[PDB]
Amino acid sequence: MECPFQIQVCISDRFFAFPHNLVEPQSDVGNKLIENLIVYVPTDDDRLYIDKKQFPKFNSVLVYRHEHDVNIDSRSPKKTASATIVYWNPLVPITEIGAGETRVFSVLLTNNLFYCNTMIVHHENPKCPIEFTYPKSNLRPIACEIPLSHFKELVESNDFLLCFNLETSTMVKILSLKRIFCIFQYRKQPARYVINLPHEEIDNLYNKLNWERTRRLMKGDVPSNCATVNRSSLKYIKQAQSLLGIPDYSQTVVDFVKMFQKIIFPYQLVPNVIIKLNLFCKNDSIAISSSGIVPINMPDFSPPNTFDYSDYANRTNINFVTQRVLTDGGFSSGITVTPVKYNYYL
Amino acid sequence: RVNRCIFASIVSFDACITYKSPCSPDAYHDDGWFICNNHLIKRFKMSKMVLPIFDEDDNQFKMTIARHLVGNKERGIKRILIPSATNYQDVFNLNSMMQAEQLIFHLIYNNENAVNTICDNLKYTEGFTSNTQRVIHSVYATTKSILDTTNPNTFCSRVSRDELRFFDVTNARALRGGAGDQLFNNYSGFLQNLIRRAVAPEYLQIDTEELRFRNCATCIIDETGLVASVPDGPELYNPIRELDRTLSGYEEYPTYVPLFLGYQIINSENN
Amino acid sequence: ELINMRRYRNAARKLIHHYSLNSTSSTEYKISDVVMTMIFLLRSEKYHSLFKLLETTFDDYTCRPQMTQVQTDTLLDAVRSLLEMPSTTIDLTTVDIMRSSFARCFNSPIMRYAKIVLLQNVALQRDKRTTLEELLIERGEKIQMLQPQQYINSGTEIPFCDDAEFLNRLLKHIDPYPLSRMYYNAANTMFYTTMENYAVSNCKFNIEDYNNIFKVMENIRKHS
């Protein structure tokens, strides 16, 4: 994982297509420009989207499918000073370094590249793709492993069905998903989409995406308010909808959350939807004036010892109140009384 | 434990006259088909059967396959095994079958107009709101819950190379042999899955090896759907004491002609 | 430390469940267990009230001790915390039964093979022993007074689930249960409930007659 010091990494959302303009020859200590350029790609499929004529500078171009090697460690990559090398969305540890610089243009930031250098090309005003499910439209399925085929449809059409062969390893599925998600975030309007895979695998993919975005943020990428939603949270949202939400809105999750955003501030308390949407890691909110949310907390933290609970925590008081309510209501059981103890400060 | 036949939910939604459920026990199996063998032989000219694919290492691999249910003298609609979207009502004269059968067939062909007409006409009948409304809701819900799973899997097949099923007639000259590939693709997902699981290709390609089972086609796709007319020749026969004494068990070799059409491609990953 | 607090905790739990809740558990209990339990109660300051209650009965074992309402509340809290069963009724009958049982045990001599004596002993209220007919008539008088609660008149046939799968799944789930354990639990439970009701009623029970004759009648009528 300890990245070699010759690697330069550029990360951007718009790298789903090959960035021909950015590829340039490198010079070794020999101070001679090297024109024999060699490129690597994940699978043979990507070879069909690399023009040999988009590199006027370079004399000769050779393409290969990046197939993982075992005889060479990443600590000491093999050096071939006779040809420049440029990687594209690599999914396994890099093992071959060309003369001088060696750029790696990728849309995914795994662990293998984390400790390398970085130049993130962040993005402005991303669109959030809309996830839904059919249970009335002309579903337009898309070959996830080769999204570049259906670029025009993705630009134009609205509904889309993520589809994966069973051959694809987890990493390639992740890469294709990230490609399509970047395509959406660049789209002019939000696009609807679904996945034809078992739910557990979808959760694994979304965990992978969340950690990828975490690494991107830890390297200084601009935050994106667009993100996936946990399936359990989805079930909670569906229950809330069935309770009161009649239709199926496009961004019904955002609808709930904003419908309670309207009330977060004036009553000074968290809407329970947010609480259930989330041990510890307790969430809060702010106003321009100094005040917390959950207890109306001060900007420091939960106070250690503010006032005694003598009149409440004593078993006598709780028992008396329990007996009073039980006698008044006619119950025999099923009623629990708890002292008001979660009183940080009024 | 649970049956997976669309016709297994066929019910007379009258609340007075009993309904029939001739679906065989095998219809509970989740083998990929979605019709009970009894309904398969009743509504269609099909009979479920299996074909095993072995090798020189004695490995087991079997695939679904169908069989003829037509004789020789039958012509016209009788020769059609699975009609197309336009020519299904005439061959099935839906006005003569039960209304629930008509609704199911309309859903299979995605005849939304017929479904809407049957629903809004059924609104008129008395006692409908009592129990016939809930029966029609149950039937519609079950039909949707059976159809739905098929469309993704059919769609995903129509997306990527995993199994390239080409209905191209072998020996391109041959006969009419229409490349109805999109007429098939114009079928609903259920119909497409049913026809894919019913007929098997003549040439098969696993990894790099090539396998062949028949020298010529058996059925053919036409604008009227899948018709069991052998290309370029008369149709094959369909069968539907001393010398017998001297003839013992001698590999009877069933003479009925099963389905054989199209071309398949197998990638390394499929199982 | 010098005290196996966990093991003594377990022993006290088992013995108190054996005497108070009178759960289906029924195994031989040796002086070791009672000694461990008493040590456990004395050790825990929370349980000093229970310890004092048990100690009091050493001299006189023939009375309910006099307490205060707050003392009773604290005692109930201690017992509930020990048993870790908030979902149970342990209000007063439980405590009286425990006191009676410990009064019998502590004031009992050493025996080679158990005693096996019913918990019908040291009833409260100091009422003269009453007969079944007298108490039954007196209580039925109150029962027959008034206040029904639901008027079901026409009568619908008892419903039955028509789905076989709903029955086959239940058969599969319930099959591993051993029948003997279920029968033994249910029988012992009915016995204990009857014993407690009768003891509170302050009457004279039929030790091996009423339940015994009932069993005998069932067996005879089914057999012959």
Q: Do A316 and C70 count as a contact with CB atoms less than 8 A apart?
A: yes
At A273, list the tokens.
């939807």
Q: Chain A residues with CB inside 8 Å of B151's CB?
A: 139
Closest of B32, B39, B37 to residue B47, by C-alpha:
B37
Task: Give strand pairing partners of A193.
Answer: A131
- Nearest CB to B269 within list A139, A141, A167: A167
Q: Do A316 and C77 count as a contact with CB atoms less than 8 A apart?
A: no
Resolution (A): 4.3
CB A236 within 8 A of CB A277: yes
Question: Identity (one letter) of the amino acid at B32?
Answer: G
Interface test with C, best of A314, A315, A317 (most C CBs within 10 A): A315
- Burial (Cβ within 10 Å: 0-12, 13-18, ≥19) of residue B62: exposed
Instruction: For residues C31 and C36, give the distance between their C-alpha atoms in angstroms, rounded to a whole number.
Output: 8
| Experimental approach | cryo-EM
Q: Chain C residues with CB inside 8 Å of A315's CB?
A: 73-74, 77
- Shortest Cα distance, chain B CAs vs residue A167, angstroms: 5
Write out residues 99-158 of B within 8 Å (CB-CB) of A. 144, 148, 151-153, 155-156, 158
Could you tell me how far CA A341 lies from the centroid of its own chain? 38
Q: Do A145 and B160 count as a contact with CB atoms less than 8 A apart?
A: yes
At A263, list the tokens.
């009330």
Question: Identity (one letter) of the amino acid at C216?
Answer: V
- Which is it for strands B225-227 and A130-131: parallel, antiparallel or unpaired? unpaired
At A211, list the tokens.
């950690």
Question: Identity (one letter) of the amino acid at A301?
Answer: F
Residue B251 CB: number of other CB atoms within 10 A? 4
Rounded to 5°, the CA angle A251-A252-A254 comes to 70
Q: Chain C residues with CB inside 8 Å of A319's CB?
A: 73
Find the closest chain A residue to C78 by CA distance: A315
Instruction: For residues C29 and B172, give the distance between their C-alpha atoms in angstroms, rounded to a whole number.
Output: 93
E-assigned strand segments in C65-221: none
- Shortest Cα distance, chain A CAs vs residue C148, angstroms: 17
- Shortest Cα distance, chain A CAs vs residue B159, angstroms: 6
Q: Do A141 and B151 count as a contact with CB atoms less than 8 A apart?
A: no
Closest of A299, A301, A321 to residue A311, by C-alpha:
A321
- Total number of residues shown for chain A: 346
Question: Identity (one letter) of the amino acid at C107?
Answer: N
At C208, list the tokens.
């091996």
- Given a contact as 3+ CB pairs under 8 Å, which chains touch A? B, C
Question: Identity (one letter) of the amino acid at B130?
Answer: S
Residue C38 CB: number of other CB atoms within 10 A? 19
Q: Chain C residues with CB inside 8 Å of A333's CB?
A: 87
- Shortest Cα distance, chain A CAs vs residue C117, angstroms: 33
Under DSSP, the state recorded for A44 is G
Instruction: For residues B3 and C99, give the distance between their C-alpha atoms in angstroms, rounded to a whole number.
Output: 63
Instruction: For residues A168 and A176, give the distance between their C-alpha atoms in angstroms, rounded to a whole number.
Output: 10
At B50, list the tokens.
């299996």
Q: Do B160 and A135 count as a contact with CB atoms less than 8 A apart?
A: no
- Nearest CB to A163 within list B144, B156, B268: B156
Rounded to 5°, the CA angle A322-A328-A331 comes to 70
How many helices (H) and strands (E) are present in chain B, helices listed first? Answer: 8, 7
Long-range contacts of B139-145 (CB under 8 A, 24+ apart): B139/B9, B139/B11, B139/B13, B139/B100, B139/B103, B139/B104, B140/B103, B140/B107, B142/B9, B143/B6, B143/B9, B143/B103, B143/B104, B143/B107, B144/A135, B144/B107
- Shortest Cα distance, chain A CAs vs residue B142, angstroms: 13
CB A248 within 8 A of CB A234: no
Residues contacting residue C65 through CB under 8 Å, at least 6 positions apart: C53, C56, C99
Instruction: For residues B191 and B43, give the distance between their C-alpha atoms in angstroms, rounded to a whole number.
Output: 13
Could you tell me how far CA C50 lies from the centroid of its own chain? 18
- In the three-class reduction of DSSP (H, G, I as helix; E, B as strand; rest coil), residue C224 is classed as coil
At B167, list the tokens.
């209905």
Q: Do A163 and B160 count as a contact with CB atoms less than 8 A apart?
A: yes
Instruction: For residues A171 and A106, give the distance between their C-alpha atoms in angstroms, rounded to a whole number.
Output: 13
Could you tell me how far CA A146 lies from the centroid of its own chain? 21
- State whether residue A306 sits within 8 Å of chain C by CB: no
CB B83 within 8 A of CB B180: no
- In the three-class reduction of DSSP (H, G, I as helix; E, B as strand; rest coil), residue A95 is classed as coil
- In the three-class reduction of DSSP (H, G, I as helix; E, B as strand; rest coil), residue A186 is classed as helix
Q: Do C73 and A333 count as a contact with CB atoms less than 8 A apart?
A: no
Instruction: For residues A149 and A144, give the distance between their C-alpha atoms in angstroms, rounded to a whole number.
Output: 10
H or E element in which residue A153 lies = helix A151-156
Instruction: For residues C54 and C95, give the distance between their C-alpha atoms in angstroms, rounded to a whole number.
Output: 11
Find the closest chain C residue to A335 by CA distance: C87
Q: Do B155 and A166 count as a contact with CB atoms less than 8 A apart?
A: no
- Shortest Cα distance, chain B CAs vs residue A154, angstroms: 14
Place of tokens 């799944």: C169
How many helices (H) and strands (E) are present in chain A, helices listed first? Answer: 8, 12
Query: Can you say whether the dihedral through the CA atoms of C199, C202, C206, C208 is positive or negative?
Result: positive
At A223, list the tokens.
């935050």
Instruction: For residues A297 and A269, give the distance between their C-alpha atoms in angstroms, rounded to a whole number.
Output: 10
Question: Identity (one letter) of the amino acid at B56?
Answer: E
Q: DSSP characters for B93-118?
A: TGGGS-HHHHHHHHHHHT-HHHHHHH
Place of tokens 């399925």: A141
Distances (CA, A) of B218 to B200, B213, C10, C19: 10, 11, 79, 84
- In the three-class reduction of DSSP (H, G, I as helix; E, B as strand; rest coil), residue A208 is classed as helix
Interface test with C, best of A332, A333, A335 (most C CBs within 10 A): A333
Q: Chain A residues with CB inside 8 Å of C70's CB?
A: 316
- Shortest Cα distance, chain C CAs vs residue A319, angstroms: 8
Instruction: For residues C21 and A270, give the distance between their C-alpha atoms in angstroms, rounded to a whole number.
Output: 45
Interface test with A, best of B159, B164, B265, B269 (most A CBs within 10 A): B159
Task: Give strand pairing partners of A120.
Answer: A11
- Which is it for strands B209-212 and B203-206: parallel, antiparallel or unpaired? antiparallel
Closest of B196, B189, B228, B235 to residue B83, by C-alpha:
B228
Rounded to 5°, the CA angle A154-A159-A165 comes to 75
Residue A130 CB: number of other CB atoms within 10 A? 18
- Given a contact as 3+ CB pairs under 8 Å, which chains touch C? A
Give the largest Cα separation in chain C, rounded: 71
Write out residues 196-215 of A within 8 Å (CB-CB) of B. 196
Question: Identity (one letter) of the amino acid at C191?
Answer: F
Find the closest chain C residue to A323 by CA distance: C73
At residue A196, what are phi and psi to the nearest 5 degrees? -95, 50
At residue B151, what are phi and psi to the nearest 5 degrees? -60, -50
- In the three-class reduction of DSSP (H, G, I as helix; E, B as strand; rest coil), residue B222 is classed as strand
At A323, list the tokens.
């007996």
Q: Chain A residues with CB inside 8 Å of C87's CB?
A: 333
- In the three-class reduction of DSSP (H, G, I as helix; E, B as strand; rest coil), residue C64 is classed as coil
Closest of B219, B178, B169 to residue B195, by C-alpha:
B219
- Shortest Cα distance, chain A CAs vs residue C29, angstroms: 34
Under DSSP, the state recorded for A45 is G
Residues contacting residue B257 through CB under 8 Å, at least 6 positions apart: B67, B68, B218, B236, B237, B238
Q: Chain A residues with CB inside 8 Å of B148's CB?
A: 134-135
CB A105 within 8 A of CB A86: yes
CB C205 within 8 A of CB C120: yes
Q: Chain A residues with CB inside 8 Å of B144's CB?
A: 135
Could you tell me how far CA C186 lies from the centroid of its own chain? 13
Q: Do B269 and A165 count as a contact with CB atoms less than 8 A apart?
A: yes
Distances (CA, A) of B136 to A3, A40, B125, B132: 65, 59, 13, 6
At residue A286, what are phi and psi to the nearest 5 degrees? -145, 165
- Shortest Cα distance, chain A CAs vs residue C6, angstroms: 26
Residues contacting residue A233 through CB under 8 Å, at least 6 positions apart: A276, A277
CB B169 within 8 A of CB B231: yes
- State whether residue B243 sits within 8 Å of chain A by CB: no
Interface test with B, best of A45, A163, A180, A199 (most B CBs within 10 A): A163
Instruction: For residues B110 and B188, give the distance between their C-alpha atoms in angstroms, rounded to a whole number.
Output: 7
- Shortest Cα distance, chain A CAs vs residue C106, angstroms: 32
- Nearest CB to B159 within list A143, A166, A167: A143
Could you tell me how far CA A235 lies from the centroid of its own chain? 20
At residue A45, what are phi and psi to the nearest 5 degrees? -60, -40
Instruction: For residues B13 and B19, give the distance between their C-alpha atoms in angstroms, rounded to a whole number.
Output: 8
- State whether residue A145 sits within 8 Å of chain B by CB: yes
Q: Do C73 and A319 count as a contact with CB atoms less than 8 A apart?
A: yes
How many helices (H) and strands (E) are present in chain C, helices listed first? Answer: 9, 0
- Shortest Cα distance, chain C CAs vs residue A323, angstroms: 12
Q: Do A165 and B162 count as a contact with CB atoms less than 8 A apart?
A: yes
Instruction: For residues A13 and A183, give the distance between their C-alpha atoms in angstroms, rounded to a whole number.
Output: 8
Interface test with B, best of A48, A136, A164, A165 (most B CBs within 10 A): A165
